[PDB]
Design a protein around this ligand. Structure first.
Ligand SMILES: Cc1cn([C@H]2C[C@H](O)[C@@H](COP(=O)(O)O)O2)c(=O)[nH]c1=O
Ligand SMILES: [Mg+2]
Length: 291
């Protein structure tokens, strides 16, 4: 049997579990299935990347562009102000999903309108990322390393920017063949200059939609009936809605902000909540027992 009490990673003060016996059972199920049955479905910004480091806020993939040298100061001020205004709505504990939804759509429209006007060149994304302050969570090498060693499918489902995200994991040496990225990917003109975004918008509250539009990916992993889902938002809880068959699913949520106001809700909807946690130690220990 699995005993969380015997696992010190689980007894750290940042680990909040509402139903420990159910988490035990779920983890026992993952262990029984092993590699052969495991897949990972994970958010990106503030789930695989850090929310803050040494007391300062770390950038999302969008923030990497907001802050980079390829954007004029005037634009950056506009972008900072949209961020202040729209982040406040995104995390607002008082507002329902349906109240927030149209403001999230609007944030993306305005942000992405301004980025297109700046004409970001594809060829500069590498430098922009290398000069950025982005940080992946502690333990990211062993997370991706262990998954790739056992050929475990990893689906990264991000409402961020796909090109930037890929470049971050590429520079960190963890963009392995088992990793699939679904995000908002830049459309470039004939000069390799940004003119728009491809496909349909993925935002904070419509991951259900793109989950169902990837049933090709999911129907090839029908045997991968044991799922570990990681997210930091309530909208991430929908990322596994396109999975073919679910036998055991464990949901791990990073609660990074408005902790006291959001804790009960997070504990009710995620199996394990990780409060102001900048490492992947908990999921790494699960992987260590499973693979
Ligand atoms: C549109 C926009 C979104 N974002 C955030 C909103 C979400 O929290 C996050 C989406 O990435 P995620 O789905 O990987 O967490 O990006 C910005 O930081 N800046 C922006 O301009
Ligand atoms: Mg996120």
């Amino acid at each position: 049997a699995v005993h969380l009490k015997m696992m010190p990673e689980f007894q750290k003060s940042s680990v909040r579990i509402k139903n420990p016996t159910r988490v035990e059972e779920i983890i026992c199920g993952l262990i029984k299935g092993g590699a052969a049955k495991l897949q990972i479905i994970t958010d990106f910004n503030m789930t695989l990347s850090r929310f803050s480091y040494n007391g300062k806020r770390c950038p999302t993939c969008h923030n990497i562009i907001d802050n980079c040298k390829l954007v004029t100061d005037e634009c950056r001020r506009k972008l900072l102000q949209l961020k202040e205004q729209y982040y406040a709505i995104e995390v607002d504990p008082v507002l329902t999903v349906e109240e927030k939804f149209p403001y999230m759509v609007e944030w993306y429209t305005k942000s992405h309108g301004l980025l297109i006007e700046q004409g970001i060149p594809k060829a500069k994304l590498k430098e922009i990322v290398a000069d950025s302050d982005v940080m992946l969570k502690e333990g990211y090498e062993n997370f991706f390393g262990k998954l790739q060693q056992h050929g475990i499918p990893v689906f990264i489902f991000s409402a961020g920017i796909g090109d930037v995200l890929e470049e971050v994991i590429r520079q960190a040496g963890v963009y392995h063949s088992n990793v699939k990225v679904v995000s908002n990917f830049m459309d470039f003109d004939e000069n390799g200059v940004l003119k728009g975004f491809k496909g349909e918008l993925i935002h904070v509250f419509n991951k259900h939609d793109g989950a169902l539009k990837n049933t090709d990916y999911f129907s090839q992993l029908k045997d991968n009936s044991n799922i570990i889902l990681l997210g930091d938002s309530q909208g991430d809880l929908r990322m596994a809605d396109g999975v073919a068959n679910v036998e055991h699913i464990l949901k791990i949520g990073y609660l990074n902000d408005r902790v006291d106001e959001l804790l009960e809700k997070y504990m009710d909807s995620y199996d394990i909540v990780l409060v102001k946690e900048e490492s992947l130690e908990v999921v790494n220990s699960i992987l260590q027992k499973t693979l």
